[PDB]
């Protein structure tokens, strides 16, 4: 039930049913894989299944976060012992950033944390770009130029 | 050994299926054109179109005086350090210009010279001349290989 | 008063059509209690464990064969899940299956006016079955999608 902002009871009943199904299915696949390993047959590892809940979201960015975690659980090596994973009603748990995301800088932040930088003529152009981009890297920037409005 | 350590690092840093991310084509001596073609076909079969060509393979050279240098050593140094670069450039250029993107990076050395400024480097004329030849090849093929393919 | 089964929250093998609808029934019981609170009808749920019967013995043997385990391991496990001992016919304390009379006494408790202040609660006639009530978490950190490779 990606459906949100209304509250659902059929959603809860579906969540309980699917969670029980996932639990019993994981147990089935696990013991089946041990049976196969005892038989020595090269068989696929146990089926790993999980559930992602969304109704418990009041915000807009819940769908993208849920899709990102869906891809994360699908593609990576990550395992989660619990079957049901709810989404917090307000995404104020890891900074904010909307789409965080990764694009246009993640290789950049933290490279110059702890430094102090004074740049001259940073009103616009290359000076503004270097000041801003180094500021995102974690240093403290001291923008000096003539026109006050462009600086602010 | 290098591949094992690299894949260990990749597995540690969170990547998945390291065995499909680092392949080896050892036993390919840069001094043979046929071995260069074999390396090209192996890389094409393994990963398809190749974007980055990091030509780093290079030996010290004859390690003698110019007046004590046999011509066969001169030819071997030119083949290993200069000819192979254009050979691999020729074999890898068609794909990069077909897909509209590409980059070849040749490992030069400071002791070979610079534009409008040469640098002596005794006992080692072959290395210097070959290295400056690599630099010249890059600086002159930048025009014709562009804008699809970079050279540096 | 609805009689559900405790195995709706345990590792209960080979019986999805038996376990899933009962968990859905528990959720329906909670929601129906909420809705019928307004109209003034009391709703109560009971969780009887493995009750003394021939059918449950056949069920345990079936689980034993389907798991590929010797007979009695299912009984030993679910009896280990208990905490309580009751005096047997000879007065000795042992771990044994709860009887139908206990469930009937609890049900007549819930039905009668003596249980007026109870609404949507759950009582377990289980001799102390210790099972995980639920397995739930929340996703409080954003996804790291840079290292994810989904080729092929």
Concatenate the DSSP letters of all residues of C1-61 into one string.
Answer: -EE--GGGGS--TT-HHHHHHHHHHHHHHHHHHHHHHHHT----EE---S-SSHHHHHHHH
Residue A51: HSE in the Cβ half-sphere, 13 Å Cα cutoff? 25
Say if strands A140-144 and C45-46 run parallel, antiparallel, or are unpaired.
unpaired
Say if strands C93-94 and C122-123 run parallel, antiparallel, or are unpaired.
unpaired
Best residue in A1, A7, A16 to probe C by mutation, most C CBs within 10 Å? Answer: A16
Report the binding-site residues of B for NADP(+): 29-30, 56, 127, 131
Residue C152 vs residues A75, B20, B69: alpha-carbon distances, Å? 11, 11, 53
Residue A79: HSE in the Cβ half-sphere, 13 Å Cα cutoff? 5
Radius of gyration of chain A measured on its C-alpha atoms? 25
Burial A75-98 (b: 16+ CB within 10 A, else e): ebeeeeeebbbbbbeebeeeeeee
Resolution of this entry in Å?
Answer: 4.1
* Chain B residues close to C149, C-beta within 8 Å: 15-17, 21
Tell me the C-alpha distance between A46 and A31, whole Å: 8
Tell me the C-alpha distance between B104 and C113, whole Å: 86
Structure tokens at B2: 């290098």
**Range list of H helices, A6-119:** 10-39, 62-75
Q: Does C144 sit within 8 Å of B17, measured CB to CB?
A: no
Q: Does B13 sit within 8 Å of C149, measured CB to CB?
A: no
Structure tokens at C69: 């385990």
Return all residues near A19 (Cβ < 8 A) that are at least 6 apart: A51, A83, A84, C23, C135
C-beta neighbour count of B100 within 10 angstroms? 9
- Give the residue from chain C lying closest to B21, CA to CA: C149
Tell me the C-alpha distance between C83 and B18, whole Å: 49
Contact C31, A13 (CB under 8 A): yes
Cis peptide before B148 (omega within 30 of 0): no
Nearest CA to CA, how far is A117 from chain C (Å)? 30
C-beta neighbour count of B58 within 10 angstroms? 21
Gaps after which residues in chain B, C–N over 2.5 Å? none
Maximal CA-CA distance, chain B: 56
* Chain C residues close to A20, C-beta within 8 Å: 8-9, 19-20, 23
Say if strands C86-87 and C93-94 run parallel, antiparallel, or are unpaired.
antiparallel
Phi, psi of C107 (to 5 degrees): -65, -40
DSSP, collapsed to helix, strand or coil, labels residue C124 as coil
Residue at token pair 């290993």: B80
Q: Does A83 sit within 8 Å of C12, measured CB to CB?
A: no
CA C17, C20, C23, C28 dihedral sign is negative
Cis peptide before A101 (omega within 30 of 0): yes
* Chain A residues close to B13, C-beta within 8 Å: none
Name the structure determination technique.
cryo-EM
Is B52 catalytic? The answer is: no
Is residue A115 marked as binding? no
Tell me the C-alpha distance between C7 and A33, whole Å: 23
Phi, psi of B46 (to 5 degrees): -70, -55
Instruction: Give bridge partners of residue A89 from the DSSP assignment.
Output: none
Tell me the C-alpha distance between B85 and B108, whole Å: 11
Q: Which letter does DSSP use for residue A118 in this model?
A: E
Burial B104-128 (b: 16+ CB within 10 A, else e): bebebbeebbeeeeeeebeebbbbb
Report the binding-site residues of B: 29-30, 56, 127, 131
């Amino acid at each position: 039930n990606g459906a949100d902002q209304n509250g659902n009871v059929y959603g809860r009943i579906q969540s309980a049913a699917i969670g029980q199904l996932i639990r019993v299915w994981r147990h089935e696949a696990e013991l089946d894989y041990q049976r196969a390993s005892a038989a020595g047959d090269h068989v696929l590892p146990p089926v790993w299944a999980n559930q992602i809940v969304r109704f418990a979201n009041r915000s807009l960015e819940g769908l993208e976060f849920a899709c990102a975690w869906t891809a994360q659980l699908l593609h990576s090596q990550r395992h989660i012992n619990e079957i049901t994973l709810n989404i917090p009603a307000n995404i104020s748990a890891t900074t904010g950033a909307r789409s965080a995301s990764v694009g246009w800088a993640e290789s950049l932040i933290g490279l110059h944390l702890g430094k102090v930088a004074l740049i001259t003529g940073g009103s616009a152009g290359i000076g503004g770009q270097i000041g801003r981009l180094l500021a995102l890297s974690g240093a403290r920037v001291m923008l000096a130029a003539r026109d006050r409005h462009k600086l602010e | 050994q290098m591949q094992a350590m690299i894949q260990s690092e990749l597995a540690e840093v969170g990547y998945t299926d390291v065995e499909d991310r680092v392949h080896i084509a050892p036993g390919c001596d840069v001094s043979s054109e046929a071995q260069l073609a074999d390396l090209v076909e192996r890389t094409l079969s393994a990963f398809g179109t190749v974007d980055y060509l990091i030509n780093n393979a290079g030996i010290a050279g004859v390690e003698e005086m110019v007046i004590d240098m046999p011509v066969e050593g001169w030819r071997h140094t030119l083949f290993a350090n200069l000819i192979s670069n254009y050979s691999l450039m020729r074999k890898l250029a068609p794909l990069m210009k077909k897909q509209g993107s590409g980059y070849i990076l040749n490992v030069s050395s400071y002791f070979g010279g610079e534009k409008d400024a040469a640098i002596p480097y005794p006992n080692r004329a072959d290395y210097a001349v070959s290295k400056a030849g690599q630099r010249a090849m890059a600086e002159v093929f930048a025009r014709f290989l562009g804008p699809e393919i970079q050279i540096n | 008063i609805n009689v559900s089964t405790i195995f709706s929250r345990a590792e209960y093998y080979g019986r999805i059509p038996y376990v899933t609808p009962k968990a859905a029934l528990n959720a329906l019981s909670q929601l129906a209690a909420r809705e019928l609170g307004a109209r003034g009808i009391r709703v109560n749920t009971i969780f009887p464990g493995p009750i003394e019967s021939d059918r449950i013995r056949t069920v345990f043997q079936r689980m034993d064969q389907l798991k590929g385990r010797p007979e009695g391991d299912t009984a030993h496990h679910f009896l280990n899940t208990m905490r309580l001992c009751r005096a047997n016919d000879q007065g000795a304390l042992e771990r044994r299956f709860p009887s139908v009379g206990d469930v009937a006494d609890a049900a007549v408790f819930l039905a009668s006016a003596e249980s007026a202040a109870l609404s949507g609660e759950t009582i377990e006639v289980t001799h102390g079955m210790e099972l995980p009530a639920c397995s739930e978490t929340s996703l409080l950190a954003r996804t790291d999608l840079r290292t994810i490779d989904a080729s092929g």
